[PDB]
RNA sequence: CCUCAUUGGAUCAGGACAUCCCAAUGGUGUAGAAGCUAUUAAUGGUUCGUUUGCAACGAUUAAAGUCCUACGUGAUCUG
RNA sequence: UUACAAAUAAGCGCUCUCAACUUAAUUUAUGAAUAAAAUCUAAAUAAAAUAUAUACGUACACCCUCUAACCUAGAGAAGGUUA
């Protein structure tokens, strides 16, 4: 309150810069978060005619995780338009060629199938590793929680924690192990 | 720098003089083409980063031309380099060890007998052509009732797809 | 290797394995006994 | 009591794989050489004539595949 | 060689054509479930192995004066050339 008409309008409809970390995150749960921010659906002032979307920056897209055997079972298909121009490439092969492709395609499908979707994709910035340009860092406003809880490896477990967990059974001494 | 394996050095721009016969000690005759290296200088250098490739780039140019019907932009480019304007520029991919300073002339001795080479140039223009001379289509018979169809393309495509595939061979500029 | 719908052992020496997503009966003594599903 | 009426070719071919040749393999009553059977693979290729109205042959080839596209295709042509 | 009884165009003349990161059938090596001095593994692993293909290359890359003339560039426009 007490803002002039012009600054108040500017503050309300300003676009925000967010950061997602894709380390060990499934690409489609990142898309759910990224797609929501891009459309501006996180804002109570959201309207389909208001161009109120936000920037989303995603890092570590090289280290995404697929549940099950989706790396080998999920296939991306494209056509150049010429006879003999149909290509079907598995998720693993697409990942090797382009580290950023899988996340970008997952987000693309989630956005509304209208002309504005292509503008939204301009607001999306994907980097395969943690490296970010200097300018992009300055823009960032807020980080975002990861959608998937990352299980710890055995090495990560502390020595105290191992002791706390009980020994369900004991090996007999007459065992090679 | 000295040569190391995997290096790529600069190339030259030359003018095509013509052809002549040539013979080997085995008596075989080989038709050969004569290429003249003519006012070939190194013009510009980029580093690997700016060219966006893994490898760097050198721009060479040959066959000095007049200065009288050229845009001011091209003339300024050469005035900085202190050379008379050249007919054509081309880009060569050169490794870092093989970089040569701009303004450096190049000569036919840059090549030696026994090495194999690759030549790229614009082909002779044939204008707008038909389908027989552009893609070697058989065509249709001369007589026996053929009505106004001798050198024409046959059926473009199939009836089902209800369109013409992109990349279909058609009459055009050859 | 015959690709058949049902895999059945044909001799004592025949043994069964699960390789590359399929069931195999492999017999060292008699290679005729080899079957894939 | 009898019955009976769309399809070739030319041009350019797109695709399926249930593979004719080329390529990688299992088995054999696989000594070698020839073969037989099955898996995998759609990669490029897959001839020229004679009598023919549907076949009938000749000479070749690594092979002269089987099918789908409204005889694929007559505002491209032809019997 | 055949034409234009032209300085050109053709073939019946001449030259040049290559790399495979990524697999399937199949075959090995190490080794658990499963006391083996077993087992190629929809166990964790290490390799070899069709046709495909574009990761990797070559080609392209210039912001460009134009009265006009000329051009191995061209339907027009475009493009090249101009002590
Ligand atoms: Mg003819
Ligand atoms: Mg006529
Ligand atoms: Mg259609
Ligand atoms: Mg075809
Ligand atoms: Mg098959
Ligand atoms: Mg028609
Ligand atoms: Mg017409
Ligand atoms: Zn057996």
Curated annotation (Swiss-Prot), chain A:
Source organism, top-level taxon: Eukaryota
Subcellular location field: Mitochondrion
GO molecular function, one term: structural constituent of ribosome
Primary location class: mitochondrion
Keywords: Acetylation, Mitochondrion, Ribonucleoprotein, Ribosomal protein
InterPro entries attached to this UniProt entry: Ribosomal_uL13 (IPR005822), Ribosomal_uL13_bac-type (IPR005823), Ribosomal_uL13_CS (IPR023563), Ribosomal_uL13_sf (IPR036899)
GO biological process, one term: translation
SUPFAM superfamilies hit by this protein: Ribosomal protein L13 (SSF52161)
CC terms in the record's Gene Ontology section: mitochondrial inner membrane; mitochondrial large ribosomal subunit; mitochondrial ribosome; mitochondrion
Pfam family, one: Ribosomal_L13
Family listed: Belongs to the universal ribosomal protein uL13 family.
Subunit-structure text: Component of the mitochondrial ribosome large subunit (39S) which comprises a 16S rRNA and about 50 distinct proteins. Interacts with OXA1L.
Protein's recorded name: Large ribosomal subunit protein uL13m
Organism of this sequence: Mus musculus
Swiss-Prot record, chain B:
One Gene Ontology cellular component: mitochondrion
GO molecular function annotation: structural constituent of ribosome
Keywords recorded for this protein, A-Z: Mitochondrion, Ribonucleoprotein, Ribosomal protein, Transit peptide
GO biological process, one term: mitochondrial translation
Subcellular location: Mitochondrion
Domain of life: Eukaryota
Family: Belongs to the universal ribosomal protein uL3 family.
Designated name of the protein: Large ribosomal subunit protein uL3m
Source lineage: Eukaryota, Metazoa, Chordata, Craniata, Vertebrata
From Swiss-Prot, chain C:
Subcellular location: Mitochondrion
Organism: Mus musculus
Assembly and binders: Component of the mitochondrial ribosome large subunit (39S) which comprises a 16S rRNA and about 50 distinct proteins.
Family: Belongs to the bacterial ribosomal protein bL36 family.
Recorded superkingdom: Eukaryota
Protein's name according to its UniProt entry: Large ribosomal subunit protein bL36m
